[PDB]
Amino acid sequence: MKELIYIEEPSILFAHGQKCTDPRDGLALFGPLNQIYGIKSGVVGTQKGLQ
Amino acid sequence: MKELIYIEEPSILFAHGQKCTDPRDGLALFGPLNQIYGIKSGVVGTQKGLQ
Known part of the structure; x- marks a missing residue:
């Protein structure tokens, strides 16, 4: 009856050679x-924009 | 036999608003x-140059 096939979910490699499926969870762990x-930034805009 | 005038040596500021005269000592203290x-380096040259 038109069988469906299932494909797994890929794994992305975070730090320490570890694997996860949700980037948020892997980044937090x-x-x-x-x-x-560090990130040295620069702001262009009005004074209210800087605030 | 004329006359020589003495000019006081200038002072260069450093961190915390401190004053010194030798950049080495001021930077060290x-x-x-x-x-x-940080400094993210980049090297262009042969492998011996990298070593």
């Missing part, structure tokens, strides 16, 4: 893969 | 004025 020490 | 979190 293990963390990103590479180390950039 | 107090440190830089701004915070860049």
